[PDB]
Design a protein around this ligand. Structure first.
Ligand SMILES: C[C@@H](C[C@@H](C[C@H](CCC(=O)O)C(=O)O)C(=O)O)C(=O)O
Ligand SMILES: C[C@@H](C[C@@H](C[C@H](CCC(=O)O)C(=O)O)C(=O)O)C(=O)O
Ligand SMILES: [Zn+2]
Ligand SMILES: [Zn+2]
Ligand SMILES: [Zn+2]
Ligand SMILES: [Zn+2]
Ligand SMILES: [Zn+2]
Lengths: 329, 327
């Protein structure tokens, strides 16, 4: 079994799983302190329920919400939307790139305890346990990010839960990350190196994949084509097309790495940790939201000659093996 | 007529002896809820703070102003609980301090104004508890975002009458830049307390600010790492000036004619996660009296220097009431 925001589910009930998504990309405490930023808490809920229902109609059964503490994860929000949409949501622990002082001053042992708490005991006072550990680098790891990476490995080794990562793909961050994880004795098959579709460097991806890493091609609909006059949207989403990102999926399949691929949208229904209009801009580019993978990417790859079975492997089996907790150390 | 507290509105006269710069818990947004075991447990933090506030109350404190912002991890439901159980009024704060997350740092002056106004006029989170003060911060020259926060604070104060209180690097004379920015928004100096002003010995800095009508926050009196010289992290944070040195600035400002503009406090806390792990224990080892330090230690030390009880009642009762009463 895998832990979700509504309790444990069996591996087979996870079905078509999006491995890197967010209900709401925010900051710790922010959604409760200033819900009017999002219209209201009720408006965000409804928005997210409609978006998940759209993904569900397109075949999605589970999403992994990789929002950490410092992404302003609100597991009570996740539970409410999961119940109303009847889509499974796996919650995350870990730290992303905006830790407050109370986190940044912590030792590797302290961070370890924090992640274990969220995995073994629960998040806040909800009883909801995390099913994945999320970490981040944006180039060379800061000394604090290193501690975060080792604490994550240590927590993964003790619990069986997988690790997923945020990278600056163009800086090949995956290489440093792997080296740190391997230094802690963590198996590559329990690690997804994320935002790997942000780069066209196939030889970086294939080398990681040959090592047993999972390759997170998780931002397929991220693109500022048509929004070139909007510098903030362009900076965030990139000027590479969704088609270009999607052809990475095909390229890895073609080089023999199907079993190392994970795909997602990296979408959200609210977004406060960037410029004020950004969610509206993103919505105008990709109204399908989280349904983009099933409605757009799958048809595109099928007509390129990727089989239905290969795609079910990537979207159902590959996530099931990743999320299934392995034996404790 | 009325000051907002975590238990609702009170009249001015109910405030009594007020500590104007305190914290129940120095932390970070969301942290107390996500990792209460950092503090032993939520229950232990509660019990610690209630005992500490009861001790201050027995020493004569009737109100504290908890200047913990959102990014100090202010938990108003915690403030409410400890206030109720210690029968000490607590005034809560809006504003922002030096550790805003991205969701705050990306906001415009207009957005931030709307946030501070919400916490004052509507309530904090979903609790209906309204802030009675706005807290801001610089540590030397203001960053561009800190300039926005200063301006939004002035605008929020101008709309509501609630006062503004500040964190400074006093030795970089931050109060001058803070004052410059506030006055460019049309804020009256009498609505502003320039805090951590006991961190400097430059009396001419303080008296020039006080001569323009600013309140002077001598708010860290018991902060001292005297006897803790082998502890780099405590020394860096608490400094090596004695409490008596800090308290003597209270007297120096009385002697210079500024008794009506002095605000005194401990800047104490009952939990502390936003620094090194041991720090609350280290701080408790040097000031076991906690928030009772002003009434039990500073008041008698000033009385023996020849400060009258009348002057002390003015500083600890009259000044905070005039400062907190909305205009
Ligand atoms: C949108 C997404 C949210 C946060 C993240 O995935 O780093 C992004 O910025 O890529
Ligand atoms: C202790 C206190 C808490 C926060 C503050 O007053 O800036 C301190 O660090 O001065
Ligand atoms: Zn990311
Ligand atoms: Zn993401
Ligand atoms: Zn195929
Ligand atoms: Zn301060
Ligand atoms: Zn303080």
């Amino acid at each position: 079994r895998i832990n979700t925001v509504r309790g444990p589910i069996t591996i087979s009930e996870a079905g078509f799983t999006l491995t890197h998504e967010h209900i709401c990309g925010s900051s710790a405490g922010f959604l409760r302190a200033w819900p009017e930023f999002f219209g209201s808490r009720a408006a965000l809920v409804e928005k997210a329920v409609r978006g998940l229902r759209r993904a569900r109609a397109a075949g999605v059964r589970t999403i992994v919400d990789v929002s950490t503490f410092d992404i302003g994860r609100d597991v009570s929000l996740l539970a409410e939307v999961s119940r109303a949409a009847d889509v499974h949501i796996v919650a995350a622990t870990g730290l992303w790139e905006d830790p407050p002082l109370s986190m940044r001053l912590r030792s590797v042992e302290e961070l370890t305890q924090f992640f274990l708490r969220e995995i073994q005991y629960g998040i806040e006072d909800t009883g909801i346990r995390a099913g994945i550990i999320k970490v981040a680098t944006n180039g060379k790891a800061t000394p604090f990010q290193e501690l975060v990476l080792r604490a994550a490995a240590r927590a993964s080794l003790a619990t069986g839960v997988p690790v997923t990562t945020h990278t600056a793909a163009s800086q090949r961050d995956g290489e440093q990350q792997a080296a740190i994880f391997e230094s802690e004795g963590l198996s590559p098959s329990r690690v997804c190196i994320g935002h790997s579709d942000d780069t066209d460097d196939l030889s970086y991806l294939t080398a990681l994949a040959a090592r047993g890493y999972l390759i997170g091609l998780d931002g397929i609909p991220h693109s500022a084509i048509g929004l070139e006059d909007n510098a903030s949207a362009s900076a965030l989403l990139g000027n590479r097309s969704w088609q270009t990102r999607a052809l990475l999926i095909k390229a890895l399949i073609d080089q023999g790495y199907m079993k190392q691929i994970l795909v997602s949208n990296d979408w959200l229904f609210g977004f406060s940790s960037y410029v004020t209009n950004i969610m509206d801009v993103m919505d105008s580019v990709n109204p399908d939201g989280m349904a983009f993978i099933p409605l757009r990417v799958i048809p595109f790859l099928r007509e390129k000659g990727v089989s239905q079975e290969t795609l079910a492997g990537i979207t159902v089996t590959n996530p099931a093996r990743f999320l299934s907790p392995t034996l404790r150390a």
